[PDB]
Amino acid sequence: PPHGELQYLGQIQHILRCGVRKDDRTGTGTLSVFGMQARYSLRDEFPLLTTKRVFWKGVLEELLWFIKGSTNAKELSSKGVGDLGPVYGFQWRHFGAEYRDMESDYSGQGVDQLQRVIDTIKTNPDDRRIIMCAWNPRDLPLMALPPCHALCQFYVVNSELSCQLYQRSGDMGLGVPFNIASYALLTYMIAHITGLKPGDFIHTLGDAHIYLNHIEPLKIQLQREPRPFPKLRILRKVEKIDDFKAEDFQIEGYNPHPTIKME
Amino acid sequence: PPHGELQYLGQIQHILRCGVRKDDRTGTGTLSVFGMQARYSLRDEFPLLTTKRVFWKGVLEELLWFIKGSTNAKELSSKGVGDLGPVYGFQWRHFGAEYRDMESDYSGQGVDQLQRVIDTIKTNPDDRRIIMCAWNPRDLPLMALPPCHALCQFYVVNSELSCQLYQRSGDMGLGVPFNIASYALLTYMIAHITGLKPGDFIHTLGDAHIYLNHIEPLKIQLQREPRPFPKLRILRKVEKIDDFKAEDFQIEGYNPHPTIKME
């Protein structure tokens, strides 16, 4: 019954082996392959990478911050890792909305994709349209109607909530393991408040790339041998998604390999 | 050097074998799997399925119609297979635009994603944002800011244009082979007018489904043995994408298996 982390790893080797040098926005070098996909069970397990230690706390507090729907950087650097622009959280909860500061009442503003997604699951779980999208701030002023950076399609069958994430770009060494843990968490959350059981998380990349300064660390991480994934426990019963707080989650069974810094 | 059609086929067997019954909008039955991906070379070949005959003409004339950016059904039923709503073509060329009839001058209106995509390739081919999106008409009146049905991310490296298509849903027996041929064509077109060489086409599905009334025909199509893919020739040199017409394309090397009707 093979390991899903064996996917991520394999993706790495491929981008290393058959990957092709490509320059990013900043003219920084990368090894790039176009179009990938990985499937990760959420059934009795949780995709917190083992081949290296993943900042689980920052993943949690970061998510909740998105769900709190905020634009306030200090509301995070004191919960783990002064106006911020409308990063994902603000989109998730009010896209279409006129963006003042971090402080004002946008209560009842724009479209609340995230509530909408939840709702749609309860109302019509066969729906092929349960989709949040998420922009890069850089893009907002840059042009009319810029393209999402990411989008999840959620999906439900036999009482099992699944989520597929599509990123136009994937930082494989630094970003990817994180998002895997994030959208896997998100899912778990939604599954929970909709009385559903977590299913698969599918991870689709456009440009999957590695930064040249990551190759070495990653070559070493490859030689590592994934311990079995942990589990994720919720310990209160929670009805509204804004009610979740960090207390509600226990990770259990997480013995990673040591941290691997990638700059 | 294996066949790409062997992918589509394999996807079929899986949805049959491990697929799970799910009800579509109309409460019609389907066998559904969530999250798939296939890669198809466009290098010296073209993904016109062989295990059955594909309506190549209708694929052509349909595309061109999109690119002509129209809302006029009769502009197609007399070129192959009275107002139509703003189907993909109109989005591709003017999303954001106020939609009158089929007849008016929307010249210079909304955002022309398709031109924009071309342009971005010439201006900044390392860009992670070369993305058109495409809506289902059904969805437009149905709610504020409905989710795309599809989106391509285009991508370029080593003088090779690639395209990945993401559909939230995939009709596997009827729709999928068609889109494969369509976005593969589109690509070829753009590659051509940007002095680029066609690369891969990646096909990502959310809900991949089969209609119960297709199972039998498909079970039979599985038993078939893919002949090698054809090629696609352009025979004029064309600079603007609105200049392409059906004359410009020869398919060569297409001996399919017989047509398979699926209702």
Numbering used by the authors:
A (entry chain A), B (entry chain A): 26 to 106, 129 to 310
Study authors write:
The only de novo biosynthetic pathway to generate dTTP (2′-deoxythymidine-5′-triphosphate) requires reductive methylation of dUMP (2′-deoxyuridine-5′-monophosphate) to dTMP (2′-deoxythymidine-5′-monophosphate) by TS. Inhibition of TS leads to the cessation of DNA replication and thymineless death of proliferating cells, which renders the enzyme an attractive target for cancer chemotherapy.
To gain direct insight into the molecular recognition of mRNA by hTS, we attempted co-crystallization of the enzyme with oligonucleotide constructs representing the TS site 1 motif. X-ray data sets were collected and structures determined for crystals grown at low salt (100 mM buffer) as well as high salt (1.75 M ammonium sulphate) concentration. Molecular replacement with previously published hTS coordinates furnished structures with the enzyme adopting either of the previously observed active and inactive conformations of the loop regions about I108-G129 and A181-A197; however, each without RNA bound. In the active conformation, the catalytic C195 is located in the active site, while it resides at the dimer interface in the inactive conformation. Previously, it had been proposed that hTS functions as a metabolic enzyme in the active conformation but as a nucleic acid-binding protein in the inactive state. Although the crystallography effort furnished structures of the protein in both the active and inactive conformation, co-crystallization of an hTS–RNA complex remained elusive.
